[PDB]
Amino acid sequence: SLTRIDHIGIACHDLDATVEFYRATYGFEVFHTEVNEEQGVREAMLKINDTSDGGASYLQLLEPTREDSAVGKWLAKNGEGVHHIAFGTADVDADAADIRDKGVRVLYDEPRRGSMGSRITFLHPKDCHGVLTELVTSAAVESP
Amino acid sequence: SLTRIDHIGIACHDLDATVEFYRATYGFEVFHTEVNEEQGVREAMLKINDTSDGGASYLQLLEPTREDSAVGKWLAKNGEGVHHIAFGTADVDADAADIRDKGVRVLYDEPRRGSMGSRITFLHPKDCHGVLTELVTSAAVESP
Ligand SMILES: CC(C)(COP(=O)(O)OP(=O)(O)OC[C@H]1O[C@@H](n2cnc3c(N)ncnc32)[C@H](O)[C@@H]1OP(=O)(O)O)[C@@H](O)C(=O)NCCC(=O)NCCCC(=O)O
Ligand SMILES: CC(C)(COP(=O)(O)OP(=O)(O)OC[C@H]1O[C@@H](n2cnc3c(N)ncnc32)[C@H](O)[C@@H]1OP(=O)(O)O)[C@@H](O)C(=O)NCCC(=O)NCCCC(=O)O
Ligand SMILES: [Co+2]
Ligand SMILES: [Co+2]
């Protein structure tokens, strides 16, 4: 079951400038930073709150590492802004198979690595009324 | 202080079809529906989780009531998808004045009515790295 909003994925041209914007404006601090070469992003997670399923909700700021990447192509076309939304689950494999069985395109056969060792998959935006939708199970199991 | 992600605002051409998509695909149910004639939207709120500040996080699905509206103009230009993100606070007036004092454009002098009697304001997306950003204080005060 999808039990939380895990994060909002926000594309930006300059991760350090956009991180500073969120810190200066709202007081949000960096929870974690990492580079995901497979996905082609430099990322910062800003934790906004904890959630009733034992998880948390984040802003995921993403700068592309290369133009020929999901985020690089999106930024080139649309400019900075919201790129995707992510829902958390305790079993991304099972929820992804259930959604596959409804005819919504699941982009990965098997979940891939996301932030902080998480396991993630994505739903095609054209099957989701224009929203690129991520499913995520945190690496650390959560106590509701 | 901004203590949660309150909601993701998602623009759609047909509220009933998009509500059904979210119910069928994810099992999300309708928390509330309403029409906001001032804003020019028919809205459905789907509650995804509660939050550690005593509030909750929602998907806010929005169909325009007229083409000459914030959402109607946005849909015409961009098609369906994420329209805005909203942060919750216990004092939207005070947080909006603090952000105004940083030079970020605050769209309302005084907060306006949002979903479920809430009081809301918005930050200009061109001041927020391309994200239309809403600030919201729930009508019912929250116990962290
Ligand atoms: C979603 C998609 C397959 C798009 O790839 P692709 O089809 O090659 O790019 P595209 O430009 O041709 O898009 C096809 C359609 O999807 C739409 N689209 C693409 N990215 C979109 C997005 N982020 N949101 C909404 N719609 C999107 C395009 O506008 C296009 O629509 P049209 O038919 O109207 O032109 C691809 O970006 C993808 O696999 N994404 C998942 C991985 C990812 O996003 N990683 C970065 C984040 C990592 C993380 O969060 O950890
Ligand atoms: C944000 C804005 C003032 C845009 O109005 P306006 O400037 O007249 O439309 P516009 O098409 O000319 O946009 C100006 C720029 O903002 C960008 N923009 C507009 N809406 C945007 C959005 N939702 N997200 C990101 N960028 C946005 C445009 O692309 C344009 O950028 P360019 O200079 O690159 O062209 C306006 O939509 C607004 O006041 N919004 C707040 C109210 C609202 O959105 N209500 C609906 C939701 C209600 C609720 O959540 O309860
Ligand atoms: Co993500
Ligand atoms: Co809103």
Automatic annotation (TrEMBL), chains A, B:
Q: Where is the VOC domain?
A: 4-138
- What is one Gene Ontology biological process annotated in the Swiss-Prot or TrEMBL record? L-methylmalonyl-CoA metabolic process
Binding of CoA, residues? 73, 77, 126
* Similarity-based family: Belongs to the methylmalonyl-CoA epimerase family.
Q: One matching Pfam family, short form?
A: Glyoxalase_4
Q: Name one GO molecular function term.
A: methylmalonyl-CoA epimerase activity
Q: What is this protein called?
A: VOC domain-containing protein
Assigned keywords, A-Z? Metal-binding
Gene3D superfamilies linked to this entry = 2,3-Dihydroxybiphenyl 1,2-Dioxygenase, domain 1
Q: What is the lineage of its organism?
A: Bacteria, Bacillati, Actinomycetota, Actinomycetes, Kitasatosporales
